[PDB]
């Protein structure tokens, strides 16, 4: 009985963005998973630039729960007394209340699409994902939430995913002012993904943007996707490199340098790129 | 408890929303196809309407009062509420003067007050639009419901006619 | 079709026998017509052309002409003499009500060829009567030739109360569903998006009451006030104002003797104001403006123009606080100039605070930054030059 | 057919959009007042209630209607419980 009640309290507090109220309730659900879940999906997708490091800390430093052991019933009572408007929400009826609770959980699971939530990792990841559904261009939104991240609170997987997906997509968005969703970007087949990555790379009237996107976006993606060989197979070829223009020549040399620097342990990839370059220059 | 003008605004707005829900319930009541098998319901609608106009006078009044209060709170600020002379256009709040050396806390307090009052003036623009929409809604529903009662009386008199006798010896 | 064609001979009989008749009789005629139209709405349902069709447009024009004539007539009847002033508004409303009551059944009809005439009645009567009454009450003198300034205030506020009394009625009319339908039709009749009918009469009322009489009121109040601030301005004892050391009463709990009269005057005036019916916004504006000008007078003609001692500032602040109390904030308010004066008097209180005597050094003075000082009184609304003026007045012995 | 509403989740979504509206308005007046062009109203300020006015009003109205339907359900349950007692 108390579980669904504190559950709906979590609902209403998250909906009203009451950090003060949701803080106490944080340790009251009995399973951190469901708490974090409702905390993620129901929370205002646009709540604040950060204003939420507190829940990160409630995830990080929970070792000595020496807070005021106010009885859950007291918590409910003082909460309803503080806010009469949600007394009707909490001082609910019979199983109809549980019906509301179950349909809310089903809505939560549906909006989640079968995403179990174990720790802050997928919490923040899925949060970034779902908020980018309306965020035009701000992959840096939750940066602060991971920039001051404590030790061993984020997996190197997440770090490399940011550095090799989030930072690259952010940089290219800022480069061409596009609204490429994170989901559609990782969704994006590498074929068209490279197609668009190498789209105006020849218009670049300078050596920074040429030797930048590759450094921070393309090469990190190839390393993360092991796409060193498939990329050079698909783009580092005579068709993409007609060598008609000095700009094409400079860009070709630059990419050769770049992925040559990248490919230093894959003998097959080095042979593939060498065949590629010698065929390119034999042909052009 | 000094009741801030914004507190009066929110209480009056909450009452106004109560009344909107009520009158919308009345409209959807008359949108139910109910026969006397309505008059004091109409009367209650007029009373609630005059309530809407009393409260809307109070609302715009306390709104102007809050505007004046804001103007006299901060010296550097010059705000002017220009009532839109056209329905399709929102009202206007031209902040004419503001000196950027004001205290940051007081700055943000003025920010929040401006935030609330802009929300209020726009919600009130949409509220006047909505009450115009709902009174046009009620009158359109009157034109459609008198006509539907016409058609219902025509259909009842028609089936009564038809069951009486229409030369059924053929 | 059946009911239309059976009304047709009725229409023929009546039209052949109603086109020439007394207009006053035409009133009861058309009322009985629309009553029978009610009847044929509810009792014997018919929803086509009514008997109204008989009345030719010329007859409608003659009728509305007689109507506008009777309107102007009754208006001049209720507006011909000065003593009609204090009740006219009400009667005026009544007349409008009567007019509204008189046209309400006529307004009840739904015939298209007459919606024009409803427009005409809205303009040449309602717009017309409102505009004419606005002009009258704007340019009217029900007051005796010989008069006092307080009476000018009184007639202005009675004017304003008439303005608000007619303005709320105008707004009710605006909310009237008949006029609403008028506005909707006329907006769909031509290329317009008019939000009301008058849209200027109401604006003229607001502009007059918020600027014209407002400013004249505050000007007259300021004038009579300076008139009452004559000798209080001449008070010179502020320098050598030795405390009447009374152990049982706070320092100078009674104000200056030369100012109590002004206090009683203002009390009377603002009392008449509060007892008069004003849209609260205007009252707040004028009260804050009076507060404003008295702050200006006190800070200029008193503060900067005289030397003060410990008890002098206390007495002066007490006087100012009494004067402001005359102008009580309604429920919740601050004031820029009030906080400014408060900051000022706090600064003045620096002479007798022998704790932070460190800032009276000429080199921290010449420094120009006073963040430490500004975090001693929580001053928020002062520039730096006036701080220098204050410390100069202090150093120059103007504050004993 | 008893009209089942569960105005709870709709209230939740309305509060969601409401806080969204509120922060959008906050940032908008922030850019406007903090607008360094004291003589030009920003298109963000205008565009807030050129784009979200109807959404804000409908969401707020839905919130209040949902809360009032819920609190009517609540006083109904209260009356039914007290009469049941």
Curated annotation (Swiss-Prot), chain A:
Location relative to the cell: Endoplasmic reticulum membrane
Superkingdom of the source species: Eukaryota
Miscellaneous information on this protein: Cells with a reduced level of SEC39 show a defect in post-translational processing of PRC1/CPY.
Family indicated by similarity: Belongs to the SEC39 family.
Free-text function comment from the UniProt entry: Required for protein transport between the Golgi and the endoplasmic reticulum. May contribute to tethering of coatomer-coated retrograde transport vesicles to the ER membrane through interaction with and stabilization of the SNARE complex.
Subunit structure: Component of a peripheral membrane protein complex consisting of DSL1, SEC39/DSL3 and TIP20. Bound to a SNARE complex consisting of UFE1, USE1, SEC20 and SEC22 or YKT6 through direct interaction of TIP20 with SEC20. Interacts with TIP20 and DSL1.
Designated name of the protein: Protein transport protein SEC39
Organism: Saccharomyces cerevisiae (strain ATCC 204508 / S288c)
Residues of the whole record sequence present: 1 to 284 of 709
Swiss-Prot record, chain B:
Post-translational modification: O-glycosylated, but not N-glycosylated.
Superkingdom, natural source: Eukaryota
Coiled-coil ranges (or none): 6-26
Compartments where located: Endoplasmic reticulum membrane
Quaternary organization: Component of a SNARE complex consisting of UFE1, USE1, SEC20 and SEC22 or YKT6. Interacts with TIP20 through its cytoplasmic domain.
Misc. remarks from the entry: Present with 4910 molecules/cell in log phase SD medium.
Function: SNARE required for targeting and fusion of Golgi-derived retrograde transport vesicles with the ER.
Protein name per Swiss-Prot or TrEMBL: Protein transport protein SEC20
Native source organism of the sequence: Saccharomyces cerevisiae (strain ATCC 204508 / S288c) (Baker's yeast)
Curated annotation (Swiss-Prot), chain C:
Gene Ontology cellular component list: cytosol; Dsl1/NZR complex; endoplasmic reticulum; endoplasmic reticulum membrane
Subcellular location per the Swiss-Prot or TrEMBL entry: Endoplasmic reticulum membrane
Membrane disposition: Peripheral membrane protein
Domain (RINT1/TIP20): residue spans on this chain: 1-400
Primary location class: endoplasmic reticulum
Keywords associated with the record: Endoplasmic reticulum, ER-Golgi transport, Membrane, Protein transport, Transport
GO terms, biological process: autophagy; endoplasmic reticulum to Golgi vesicle-mediated transport; protein transport; regulation of ER to Golgi vesicle-mediated transport; retrograde vesicle-mediated transport, Golgi to endoplasmic reticulum
Note in the entry: Present with 6020 molecules/cell in log phase SD medium.
Annotated function: Required for protein transport between the Golgi and the endoplasmic reticulum. May contribute to tethering of coatomer-coated retrograde transport vesicles to the ER membrane through interaction with and stabilization of the SNARE complex.
Subunit architecture: Component of a peripheral membrane protein complex consisting of DSL1, SEC39/DSL3 and TIP20. Bound to a SNARE complex consisting of UFE1, USE1, SEC20 and SEC22 or YKT6 through direct interaction of TIP20 with SEC20. Interacts with DSL1, SEC39/DSL3 and the cytoplasmic domain of SEC20.
Protein name: Protein transport protein TIP20
Organism of origin: Saccharomyces cerevisiae (strain ATCC 204508 / S288c) (Baker's yeast)
Organism lineage: Eukaryota, Fungi, Dikarya, Ascomycota, Saccharomycotina
Part of the full-length chain shown: 302 to 701 of 701
Curated annotation (Swiss-Prot), chain D:
Signal sequence segment: none
Subcellular location: Endoplasmic reticulum membrane
Top-level taxon of origin: Eukaryota
Protein purpose: SNARE required for targeting and fusion of Golgi-derived retrograde transport vesicles with the ER.
Family: Belongs to the USE1 family.
Miscellaneous comment: Present with 937 molecules/cell in log phase SD medium.
The protein's assembly and partners: Component of a SNARE complex consisting of UFE1, USE1, SEC20 and SEC22 or YKT6.
UniProt-recorded name of the protein: Protein transport protein USE1
Taxonomic source organism: Saccharomyces cerevisiae (strain ATCC 204508 / S288c)
